[PDB]
């Protein structure tokens, strides 16, 4: 558990519908949502792979579990029942535990993705911005839509805005 989903970010965004993890920017040119498509696609691929691994690893074979025994073959009927009950117990325990564990894995996987996005942005801005605490960054320098498109992309030019940010810090 990393502490982002239901942590220092206390809620999801219903408005942001074009992805799973994203940004919300507020400039003098306006406000908007913009999902991070690369991280969302990576998450989709990995969750898809997990679903495929759980579903497409069964390797079932043709069988007929029903067997008929007469009144004088009660012991063999009991053996067949025992086999069936043992298989049922093994499979129910394994299925329940597997689902319970992989649900944890998926939820912590998403929580790690959100944290990683936050740390990437934070390390990319350094001291040009102030960390509010809710999960947000208030810029010390006035920067436009191109600046935040660069921050989303990962090409923030810190030296460009450093001198501007020093005066207001």
């Amino acid at each position: 558990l990393f502490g982002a989903i239901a942590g220092f970010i206390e809620g999801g965004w219903t408005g942001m519908v074009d992805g799973w993890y994203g940004y919300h920017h507020q400039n003098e040119q306006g406000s908007g949502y913009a999902a991070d498509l690369k991280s969302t696609q990576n998450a989709i691929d990995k969750i898809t792979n997990k679903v495929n691994s759980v579903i497409e690893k069964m390797n079932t074979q043709f069988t007929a579990v029903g067997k008929e025994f007469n009144h004088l073959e009660k012991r063999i009927e009991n053996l067949n029942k025992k086999v069936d009950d043992g298989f049922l117990d093994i499979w129910t325990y394994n299925a329940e535990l597997l689902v319970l564990l992989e649900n944890e894995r998926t939820l912590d996987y998403h929580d790690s993705n959100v944290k990683n996005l936050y740390e990437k942005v934070r390390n990319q801005l350094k001291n040009n911005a102030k960390e509010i605490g809710n999960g947000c960054f208030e810029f010390y320098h006035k920067c436009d839509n191109t600046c935040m498109e660069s921050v989303k992309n990962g090409t923030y030019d810190y030296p460009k805005y450093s001198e501007e940010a020093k005066l207001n810090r």
């Binding site: 043709f62 007929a64 579990v65 029903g66 067997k67 008929e68």
Partner: protein
């Protein structure tokens, strides 16, 4: 007496291999075959006992 009869009839079956022969010899009490079944088998399945309709 079950089904109005006090005697009995035991029913027997066998599989004759290709090229093999079956021989019946009797002085009485024999219910001879009339129809045999040329049969070819597979891996095996079961018998579903149900009232569900067949479609």
């Amino acid at each position: 007496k079950v089904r109005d009869q006090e005697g009995r009839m035991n029913y027997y079956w066998t599989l004759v291999e290709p090229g093999d022969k079956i021989t019946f010899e009797a002085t009485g009490n024999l219910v001879v075959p009339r129809y045999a079944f040329t049969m070819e088998r597979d891996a095996g399945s079961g018998i579903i006992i149900s009232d569900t309709p067949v479609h």
